[PDB]
Amino acid sequence: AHAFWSTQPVPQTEDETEKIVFAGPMDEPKTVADIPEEPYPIASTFEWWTPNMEAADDIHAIYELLRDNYVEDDDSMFRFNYSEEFLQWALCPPNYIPDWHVAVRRKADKKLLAFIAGVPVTLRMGTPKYMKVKAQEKGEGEEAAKYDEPRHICEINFLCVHKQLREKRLAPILIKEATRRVNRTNVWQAVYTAGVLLPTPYASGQYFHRSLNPEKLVEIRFSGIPAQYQKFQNPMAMLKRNYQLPSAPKNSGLREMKPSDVPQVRRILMNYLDSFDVGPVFSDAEISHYLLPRDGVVFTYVVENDKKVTDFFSFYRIPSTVIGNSNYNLLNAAYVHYYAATSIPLHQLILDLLIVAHSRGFDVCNMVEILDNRSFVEQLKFGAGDGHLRYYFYNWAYPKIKPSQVALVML
């Protein structure tokens, strides 16, 4: 049934995942010297290509492939349109490895046909607290804590095959070649997400949406006027009134994050994330890169009281193409990124997120039910969407965990 994922080091079934108790590796311990030095064989009409993320043309090529061929919703109404500036930010974090961005081009015209990206991440991915306490009481704490130390692994995203090339087994060939390039750097684990079911997720979380411009959302059929809104005489006025937001933030200490905030945000974020079972570890340079405001890409606000940053939130932008709508070309979506609250309830901090997003012209705020994102769903008027984001490891045994125990936000 899975001609490719059968040949790979991942759990093969739910309830192998349900069985697993300790974190740890799957494949044979291997060495760099074992890995072929030559690229994986590919048909002679194609060629492997390592884009230069510092070249505007190369970024443009990847931008057009993804604009026309990347992720759609289940009804083919929307497709992500990541910007070139977003792709530059996502694909070139501190100490990125240029060789981990892998593409396939047609040799004759150099047309981009397929792409996959890997970047570094430092991830806590040892045994979950729940399996560790079981282990303690059963005598096995040492084996449980064996892989507690954050690991320098690969995070995979932006897998894409051109629509004209679909179901020709090109995605396996890409994943093989990315794995070879990563393994040649002496890295042996990857983390990735997908909105499809594959063998086998260690966590799954529902999508959630918060309407900011319900007029537009209904016009492009992201949303409907719910049946309940019919035995009111007036549908849309009532819908606007329901989702209306203040014009200005209500926390008085709120301002955009600036470079001098990097150490304190790093500290309050690391203290919050270290509570979850699977989560990233960031250096100052990675906090700067992923959280300092960048126009049209990432937006970050701190609450500063008496010169001390005590809370912050961030969100990132992905516009979606509205596939065949006359009136609207684009859906302008904000996605909740990292945050930390120490002085105010999380609902109060995220309200300010919604207020800034709406003021800056976003149409909806989207998120997955990871981190403590459930604690503000009802009071902030989020709704569950129709789908789940699934979390996976390559070469890592891991128990099934709840999504409220995951702290890795994917872009």
Ligand X SMILES: CCCCCCCCCCCCCC(=O)SCCNC(=O)CCNC(=O)[C@H](O)C(C)(C)COP(=O)(O)OP(=O)(O)OC[C@H]1O[C@@H](n2cnc3c(N)ncnc32)[C@H](O)[C@@H]1OP(=O)(O)O
Binding characters for Mg ion, 293-332, by CB under 5 A (x = yes): ----------------------------------------
Is 78 a binding residue for ligand TUQ by CB under 6 A? The answer is yes
Q: Which residues of 40-76 are buried (b: 16+ CB within 10 A; e: fewer)?
A: eebeeebbebebebeeeebbebbbebbeebbbebeee
Residue 341, marked binder: no
String of contacts with ligand X for each residue 43-72, x by CB under 6 A:
--------------------------xxx-
Show contacts of 179-184: CB within 8 Å, 24+ apart.
179/394, 180/35, 180/36, 180/39, 180/40, 181/99, 181/100, 181/102, 181/118, 182/100, 182/118, 182/154, 183/30, 183/32, 183/35, 184/32, 184/35, 184/37, 184/99
* Sole binder of ligand TUQ in the list 94, 141, 195, 235 (CB under 6 A): 195
Cα three-residue angle 291-403-69, rounded to 5 degrees: 65
Return the number of the residue (59 or 161) whose C-beta is nearest Mg ion. Answer: 161
Give yes or no: 411 in active site: yes
Is 171 known to sit in a ligand binding site?
A: yes
Return the closest-CA partner of residue 89 out of 350, 306, 300: 300
Q: What's the min distance (Å) between Cβ of 223 and ligand X? A: 23
Total of residues contacting ligand X (CB under 6 A): 36
Q: Is 3 annotated as a binding residue?
A: yes
Residue from 170, 262, 287, 411 in contact with ligand X (CB under 6 A): 170
For ligand TUQ, the closer CB: 58 or 73: 73
Closest Cα partner for 101 from 83, 119, 80? 119
The answer to whether residues 76 and 70 touch, using CB atoms and an 8 Å cutoff, is no
Regarding beta strands 190-194 and 151-161, do their DSSP bridges make them parallel or antiparallel, or are they unpaired?
parallel
Q: What angle do CA 48, 40, 391 make, to 5 degrees?
A: 85
End-to-end CA separation in angstroms for the chain:
30
Q: Which residue is nearest to ligand X (CB)?
A: 2
Q: 317 among the known binding-site residues?
A: no
Q: Binds 179, which of ligand TUQ, ligand X, Mg ion, none (CB < 5 to 8 A, cut-off by type)? A: ligand X
147 belongs to the binding site for ligand X (CB under 6 A): no
Report DSSP state, residue 69: H
Asked if 89 touches ligand X (CB under 6 A), the answer is: no
Annotated binding site for CoA: 2, 4-5, 161, 167, 169, 171, 193
User: Contact positions toward ligand TUQ, by CB under 6 A?
Assistant: 71-73, 78-80, 193, 195, 207-209, 320, 331, 333, 335, 366-368, 385, 389, 410
User: Contact positions toward ligand X, by CB under 6 A?
Assistant: 2-5, 69-71, 154, 156-161, 166-172, 175, 178-179, 182-183, 187-190, 192, 194, 196, 198, 394-395
Annotated binding site: 2-5, 159, 161, 165-167, 169-171, 193
Positions annotated as catalytic residues are 411
